[PDB]
Amino acid sequence: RDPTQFEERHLKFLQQLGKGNFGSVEMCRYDPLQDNTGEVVAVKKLQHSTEEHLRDFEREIEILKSLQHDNIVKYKGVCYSAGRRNLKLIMEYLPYGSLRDYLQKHKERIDHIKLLQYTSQICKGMEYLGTKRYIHRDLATRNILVENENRVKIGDFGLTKVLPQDKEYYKVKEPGESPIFWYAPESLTESKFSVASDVWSFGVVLYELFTYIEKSKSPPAEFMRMIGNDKQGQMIVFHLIELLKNNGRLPRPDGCPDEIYMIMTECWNNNVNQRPSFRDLALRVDQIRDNMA
Numbered sequence: 144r145d146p147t148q149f150e151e152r153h154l155k156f157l158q159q160l161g162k163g164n165f166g167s168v169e170m171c172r173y174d175p176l177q178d179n180t181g182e183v184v185a186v187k188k189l190q191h192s193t194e195e196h197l198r199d200f201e202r203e204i205e206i207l208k209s210l211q212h213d214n215i216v217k218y219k220g221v222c223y224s225a226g227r228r229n230l231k232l233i234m235e236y237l238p239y240g241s242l243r244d245y246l247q248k249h250k251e252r253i254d255h256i257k258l259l260q261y262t263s264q265i266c267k268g269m270e271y272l273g274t275k276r277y278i279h280r281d282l283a284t285r286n287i288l289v290e291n292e293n294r295v296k297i298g299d300f301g302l303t304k305v306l307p308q309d310k311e312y313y314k315v316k317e318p319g320e321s322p323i324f325w326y327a328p329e330s331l332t333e334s335k336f337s338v339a340s341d342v343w344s345f346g347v348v349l350y351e352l353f354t355y356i357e358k359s360k361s362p363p364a365e366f367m368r369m370i371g372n373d374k375q376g377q378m379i380v381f382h383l384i385e386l387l388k389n390n391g392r393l394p395r396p397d398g399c400p401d402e403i404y405m406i407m408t409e410c411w412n413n414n415v416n417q418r419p420s421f422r423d424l425a426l427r428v429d430q431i432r433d434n435m436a
């Protein structure tokens with residue numbers, strides 16, 4: 144029998160874990176003996192399993208399956224439905240949930256040493272991803288999962304794209320729901336996504352971590368304040384682009400160490416080529432951890 148081949152009939156629903164963009168994730172027990180002793184897994188499925196969505200979902204599955212790293216959620220297998228060929232992605236279940244909820248829950252009880260451990264781990268997952276020429280496009284604390292107190296993993300790849308052989312960016316022609324408050328200026332203006340725009344988003348993740356997910360301090364709350372809460376729909380994007388062009392930025396989180404703040408601000412460079420590399424960020428973060436320890 145194939146362990147990566149899961150029969151949907153044996154999957155028992157336990158609880159809902161999240162909904163992002165097109166897919167929904169559920170906690171399920173794979174219980175073929177039907178006695179509640181089987182493994183608990185996370186199961187991602189599509190809410191609207193159209194032709195086009197299914198095609199994109201299958202590419203996402205191949206992306207995750209190709210990744211093997213301590214800080215990337217583990218692929219376990221796939222479910223296939225008879226007939227129209229609906230797909231479910233089976234992944235390891237990480238019991239402490241999303242980093243966003245985890246931090247929002249425990250707040251400052253998670254100290255700076257711990258936050259920088261998570262930062263380094265996120266950096267390393269992204270650096271590895273980049274070696275495969277994948278662009279995440281959706282790096283945010285809501286897409287990072289907590290395995291235990293000492294380890295986080297990048298947990299969703301629903302927007303992930305593979306770079307063309309000959310280009311260092313991927314251009315999205317018809318944008319869907321976009322996390323614009325995590326987007327680099329060139330992603331907003333030209334829909335260009337690259338390792339460097341992932342670095343920009345990583346700076347926003349660093350901001351998220353050091354604000355402890357204080358709601359009034361979220362990137363959407365802060366950017367909306369800066370452009371004016373009166374701005375709506377497409378005008379938000381127009382004014383955000385103008386703000387960023389004029390070096391409008393998220394503020395330093397209260398109590399943030401200057402060395403960490405410096406990293407955020409370097410990630411948020413309008414000049415794409417001047418943003419740091421994930422290889423260098425991992426080294427820099429680990430050095431800061433070493434100095435603190």
Ligand SMILES: Nc1n[nH]c2ccc(Br)cc12
Nearest residue numbers: 161168185234235236237
């Ligand atoms: N809690 C989780 N464990 N594993 C997951 C995979 C994807 C998503 Br979304 C959540 C989880």
